[PDB]
Structures are given as C-alpha cells and as structure tokens.
Symmetry: C3
Subunit: 149 residues, 3 copies
C-alpha cells in the first residue's frame, strides 16, 4: 500500500472590516482575515497538505477557498490517490472557535468527499504570546494522509 | 490497513514560581510553564495529535486534572476504545533555554510508558528558536507532535 | 505494514554577509541564513523529520552543533548521512513533504531546484518529494524578513 504524508501551514492578518471565515464557517466578529481569496486560513492549510501528500506542488502553483479545496480533491483523485484522513489546528486568540468546529468539519468532509469520522479540526489559543496571542492574525496547520492507487 | 495521521501544537509562557515540566520530566530551571494544568506543552501536543488522528476532537473538547501524564494515559484509553492502535509518535520542543537535549531520554521513557509503546516508537527532538520572536527571547516554549494510528 | 511518521521544524536568522542556501539551492540575495553549518533551514527540517520517524533522535544528536567538524558544513552531506542511517536502521522512505516560509526573496521559483537536490540526496524519485513555499503575510519576525522557517513531514516503512 503506497501511503503518503502531507502537511500545510497558513497564516493571515486579522483586520477591521472583513468577515471572519474559517473552515468555510462565517464567524461573527469585528475583524476578519485579509488576503486575495476569502483568506480562509484553515481551508488553505488543508489544501496545501493535500497537494503536498500528492507531490502536486502547492496552493500557489495551482490557484472561494471551498472551490479551491474541491478542485484540489479532484486533482488529487485524478492523480490516483485516495484520502485517508485530515487533521488540523486553528490558532486564534479570539473569538471562541469551539461552537463552530462541527460546521468546519462538515464543510471539509463534503468538499473532500469524506465521512465526518475522517476529518478533524482542533482549536487552540497562543496563550497571549506573539502576533497570534495579540489577535493580529490567525494560523492554521494541517496534515493529510493519502494512499496511491 | 486503515492508517490515520494526527498533528498537535501547544505553547505556554515561562513564568517564575512554577516548575518546568516537559514530557513529564521535571527540569531544574528558574522558571516554569504557566497554565491551569501543569502546562506540559509536549504531553499536550502529543495528546492533541493522538485525538486528532482518531478524529476525537482535542484536549479542550475533552480531563480536568492538572497532571498531563494522567491525561495522556486517558487519551490512550479513548484512542484504544475507539478501535485504533498507535504506530508511533514524533515531536519537537522549542525553547531558547534551558538546553533540552539532556532531558529528552526521560521524556521518551514517560511517553512510551503512558502510551504502552516501546521506546523505538517514540521520538522527541529539541530545538531553539535562534533568538527569534517570543520563543527566541525565552518567553515561552512550544511543542509540535505527529502521531500515526491504524484503525483495527 | 510498519509505517512511521516524522516531523521537523527549523528556523534561522537572515544576516548580511552569508550566502542564502535553501534546499541546497544558492539563491541570489543580499542576506543569508546564520547558523553553525551553512544553516540550510529546509534540509535541517527534513533531516529532523527523517531521524524523528526512525526514532533516531534528532540532527543535534548526530552532528553536534558545537563540534568544529560541522562548522560551515554543507547540509546536503548531513542529509545524505541521515538518509543512510535511516535506511540502515531498516526503513524505506515513502515520501517527504515540506514548506518554507519567507517574506523574501521569492522562493516559489526555486522549489523545483530544491526538490531535485532532496530527491537525489534521498535516492527517491521526484514524485515522492515535495516542497511548498509561503510568506508569513507580513506577520512577526518572518513577516518582517528577519529569518526563514521550514517545516517537514516524512513517512517511513520499517522492513
Ligand atoms: Zn491563505
Ligand atoms: Zn498546553
Ligand atoms: Zn538549522
């Protein structure tokens, strides 16, 4: 069985006057993530992990963060891989992410064609350290495992 | 073989009047890690990597005790009960001081004991942050972990 | 099948007067990474992911960062020695994935050169080696161009 690992990282600044969208869930908050796309740090980190596992390069090579994640899953499937699972962490000082985690997992699972039991998202703060601990930005990390057919 | 990956991250601030406990090892040092638990940054990241691979959420979603070895063992029991077995764990601790390398063996032996795994399936690595950022100024300590499971 | 995961992290400061070598690629730039060896952050993070998946400790356990032998060391030589220890311990490498994070210079145009070196060093085909490039969106020391971070993941199977 030809198993492959991938890992992803993303970070965006948080700014006034942008919606906060993470894992495709819009979360009520006075600030949101700055980027070219909707800046969805969590979907971007998972997309990178998936391309990384498939050795299809990265998000910048290929490319709604949902649309991108769905095109990523297509390209990975087309390259002959199946997705075993995704795990991820979002690091944000605020707001509270816990009540939105199930929604992110549902969006991710739909977009990757997986059952919910193969998708995990975890939330952390940065314990008031650094730009994350001060609310100036939000980070996501992801890991994915593929099997090549 | 139904293999699954998990990854974990944790960071705590260094403060006076706390012991420094990492990988269950008490490390002599003028400061220790701040949290509501014993703030064992390494055991927390590994615990999160293990729940993450089993798709059982995270430490937050779970476990009220301060002793992070008790939490790591309960983690292992939940993982086992969910039908998985652990292939291995690897991890990194980042601290500008003290030097962590002489303390790594003891963390390996604590984690191995708590997960019921032989030493050869348990790895801990030590890094500094090259005097960059809050880590590089000695203001806290970060750990990263990865774990692989097989659902049986 | 006895599969094992490894992960790696490294970060170095950018300073005047050093070459910039990442993934074994010399990149033209006014600053380079500072460390004991040539400070190749990406090879170091992959080297740590490889030792970590094989439970062989870490780069500092094998190549001391205060031993004169490794002052200015070409980090490809350490990567190749790491891969030989990992194979000798009974493992084959399934694949490596990695990310380099720098606000500057642009790293995306150099990814394919880094993959080529790493694949050659690990005795792997290109389709088992991946390197991704990111910026830090002007956040923190990485966002202000003060250093460059690398992250890696390696998957082994024990024979
Ligand atoms: Zn992004
Ligand atoms: Zn913690
Ligand atoms: Zn290094």
């Amino acid at each position: 069985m030809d198993v492959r690992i991938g890992q992803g990282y993303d970070v965006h600044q948080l700014v006034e006057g942008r919606p906060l969208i993470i894992g495709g869930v819009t979360i009520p908050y006075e600030r949101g993530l700055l980027g070219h796309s909707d800046a969805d740090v969590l979907l971007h980190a998972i997309t990178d992990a998936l391309f990384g596992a498939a050795a299809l390069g990265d998000i910048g090579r290929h490319f709604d963060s949902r649309v991108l994640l769905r095109a990523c899953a297509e390209r990975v499937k087309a390259a002959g891989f199946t997705i075993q699972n995704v795990d991820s962490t979002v690091i944000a000082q605020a707001p509270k992410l816990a009540p939105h985690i199930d929604g992110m997992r549902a969006n991710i699972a739909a977009d990757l064609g997986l059952p919910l039991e193969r998708v995990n998202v975890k939330a952390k703060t940065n314990e008031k350290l650094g730009y994350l601990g001060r609310g100036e930005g939000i980070e996501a990390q992801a890991a994915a495992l593929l099997v090549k057919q």
